Write a protein that binds this ligand. Structure first.
Ligand SMILES: [Br-]
Length: 208
């Protein structure tokens, strides 16, 4: 269909707090090692004062921390979710279906992604590289999209409604029951990957 509204609102949510886009990619690369990430480590990678790392993370209210206050989850996460994101046999996780399509390009790694259809519980899997998706199972796999909302917890507002589905008709059947969701739309996983490529292209533009 036409996915500009989703690209627009995703970019605005990242660019709404200065620093977020510039912290996101280095943080995702660190989390992809599979270990908790300290604020001190992040400040050193960014060459930022600690107070600036703090102020950016303060606005990212969905950030997940461990017992030591290390970062363990920001889109990519060490804590188990419905979206399995495996790189180099390290099993990591993602907050939503679209995250699994976006991250490989940002971290420069190929991921074996797996989940379950949110309508039928059927297993779904695919391989996501920086440039392409392969081994899409089922081939007709679909994704739900909603419009992110201003100054809402991004994970309860967006990620929790962005699922994989076994097929577009299965997802549209599910979608008929959930019309209260703002801007709910069903797309193929290829369309969703294209949305991710457009997001990532604009994201890298706006980095320092
Ligand atoms: Br449009």
């Amino acid at each position: 269909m036409k996915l500009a509204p989703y690209i627009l609102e995703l970019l605005t949510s990242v660019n709404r707090t200065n620093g977020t886009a510039d912290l996101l990619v280095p943080l995702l690369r660190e989390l992809a090692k599979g270990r908790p990430v300290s604020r001190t480590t992040l400040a050193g990678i960014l060459d930022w004062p600690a107070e600036r790392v703090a102020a950016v993370l303060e606005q990212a209210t969905s950030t997940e921390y461990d017992k030591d206050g290390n970062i363990i989850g920001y889109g990519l996460t060490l804590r188990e979710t419905s979206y399995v994101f495996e790189i180099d046999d390290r099993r990591l996780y993602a907050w939503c279906a679209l995250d699994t399509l976006i991250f490989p390009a940002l971290i420069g790694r190929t991921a074996r992604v797996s989940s379950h259809c949110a309508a039928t519980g059927a297993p779904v899997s695919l391989t996501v590289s920086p440039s392409e998706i392969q081994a899409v199972e089922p081939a007709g796999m679909a994704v739900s999209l909603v419009l992110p909302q201003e100054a809402a917890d991004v994970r309860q507002s967006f990620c929790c409604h962005v699922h994989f589905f076994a097929s577009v008709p299965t997802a549209e059947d599910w979608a008929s029951k959930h019309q209260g969701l703002e801007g709910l739309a069903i797309v193929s996983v290829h369309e969703a990957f294209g949305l991710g490529q457009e997001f990532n292209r604009h994201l890298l533009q706006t980095m320092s």
